[PDB]
Amino acid sequence: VPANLMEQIHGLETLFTVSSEKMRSIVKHFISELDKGLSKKGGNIPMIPGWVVEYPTGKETGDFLALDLGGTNLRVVLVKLGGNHDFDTTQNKYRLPDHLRTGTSEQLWSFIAKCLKEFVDEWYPDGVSEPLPLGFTFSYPASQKKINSGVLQRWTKGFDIEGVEGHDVVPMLQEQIEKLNIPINVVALINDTTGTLVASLYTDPQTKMGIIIGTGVNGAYYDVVSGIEKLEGLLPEDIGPDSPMAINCEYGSFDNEHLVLPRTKYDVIIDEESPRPGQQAFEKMTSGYYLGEIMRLVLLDLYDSGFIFKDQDISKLKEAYVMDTSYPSKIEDDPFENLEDTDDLFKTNLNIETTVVERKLIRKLAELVGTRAARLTVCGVSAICDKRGYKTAHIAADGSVFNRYPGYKEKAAQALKDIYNWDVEKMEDHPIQLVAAEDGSGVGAAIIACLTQKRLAAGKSVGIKGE
């Protein structure tokens, strides 16, 4: 590598390296923001009560349903809990008819009830011993004052179904179920990350957090009612001050004030050019969705400063979001020093021929961007653990970045070791460690339906007093 590109590589390292000291300072601020979101005044982190007020014991048994409404497919899941932190599952995916996304409320709920009937008649052709409790993962902006409710705030993902916004979807679905005489009760409506937490806690009793690291980012954990100022004066007597309370953090909005995250000029460009400038600061700094875009902007800056691709037509590189997450992924997986996979990637998809030294810079840039994202993500993990005093923990993780991004598990484990300065040799022995989660939107909704029914059947509250 010439002196010129070496100097530029040192510049990249200065841009993107996050020190252990910086991570610790981010964590302290993150803790303050978690506390702020639970306060009466609130803050940028929503810290949404999830209305799960008990831990699964792992001894639960029985048959429970989950529903998840996608943009393309409805997923219906049957979960049979085995009573020893174990379960069996089966599922069907039903393609949404083309018209449904822009149709009516009646059409939506009638379609979903018809699929549930088909599913129940397949698996229980002779009927059921008692009605099947159902948890509904409803992945649209919604709020709830009790778990067996969800008021749609606004449709997203190309949906525009008339007569649903501002209404509680749970009775809408239940009415269609009852019209078809299907033995189901819809007892819970959840965010998928809450499901990731609860399903993983049922199978792994050391789970302290559910975390999604993908296109979107989120984390869920259990707090305690006495630590939630914003619920003071709103709770019934049977949700007491020592009660657990699952929290869906929605922490992608952490540090919208831009006080601690180490944003570069490239991150500022991404934010300025995004659909919502000034929003989702932590998501923009940690989501896989932006990793290729960060690289694209750095490479354009290097080109404009005269350092790289000097005799190339870089037209294709000028298109925002042309480099998705597969770019840094394939680049980091490239096995040999001459970076042949990177060469093919640039030539084939961008029409850019590169030198080996240029590919070395691109590889270092990919490593820096993947590593920064992992190090910032684990600041959320450390903040939850430190807030709650978890000295050891399993952090149940899911999402395309955790599952597929090269070396992510090693990057995250090293980040936690750096934060805590642990004297520990093996990754498997780290006091706080990421482990693969159970299925939150299916299995987790079904398990939350089980926990909810325990309280419902006893006449115990699962929401605000009077709701």
Q: What type of residue sits at position 52?
A: V
Query: Within the chain, which residue ranges are assigned CATH 3.30.420.40?
Result: 59-191
Q: Which residue(s) pair with 248 in the sheet?
A: 48, 220
The CATH classification of domain 59-191, taken from the options 1.10.287.3510, 3.30.420.40, 3.10.20.30, 3.40.50.300:
3.30.420.40
Phi, psi of 433 (to 5 degrees): -145, 145
* Half-sphere exposure of residue 123: CA atoms within 13 angstroms, side-chain side: 23
Query: Within the chain, which residue ranges are assigned CATH 3.40.367.20?
Result: 192-467
Find, among 350, 136, 427, the residue nearest to 342 by Cα: 350
Q: Among residues 139, 243, 274, 326, which one is catalytic?
A: 139
Distance CA 401, CA 407 (A): 10
> Which residue has 């009775």 as its token pair?
171
Query: Within the chain, which residue ranges are assigned CATH 1.10.287.1250?
Result: 1-58
Distance CA 199, CA 192 (A): 10
Distance CA 71, CA 20 (A): 40
Helix (H, G, I), strand (E, B) or coil at 149: coil
3-state SS, 376-426, equals HHHHHHHHHHHHHCCCCEEEEEECHHHHHCCCHHHHHHHHHHHHHCCCCCC
**93 labeled binding residue:** yes
Residues 303 and 378 sit within 8 Å (Cβ to Cβ): no
Experimental method: X-ray
Helix (H, G, I), strand (E, B) or coil at 295: helix
> Which residue has 């009937």 as its token pair?
117
Find out if CATH 1.10.287.1250 is the number for domain 1-58: yes
List, comma-separated, the residues after which the chain is broken, a break being a C to N distance over 2.5 A; otherwise answer none: none
CA 211 and chain centroid, separation: 6
Resolution in A: 1.5
Is 143 annotated as catalytic?
no
Is 455 annotated as catalytic?
no
Report the side by side order of strands in the sheet with 207-213: 48-49, 244-248, 217-224, 207-213, 393-398, 432-436
Fold of 192-467: Hexokinase; domain 1 (3.40.367)
Q: Which residue(s) pair with 133 in the sheet?
A: 185
Q: Is the dihedral of CA 252, 257, 262, 268 positive or negative?
A: positive
Phi, psi of 143 (to 5 degrees): -135, 160
Is 154 annotated as catalytic?
yes
> Which residue has 């008021």 as its token pair?
151
Q: What type of residue sits at position 360?
A: K
Q: Among residues 19, 39, 121, 154, which one is catalytic?
A: 154
Residues 379 and 372 sit within 8 Å (Cβ to Cβ): no
CA Rg, the chain, in Å? 24
Residues 374 and 187 sit within 8 Å (Cβ to Cβ): no
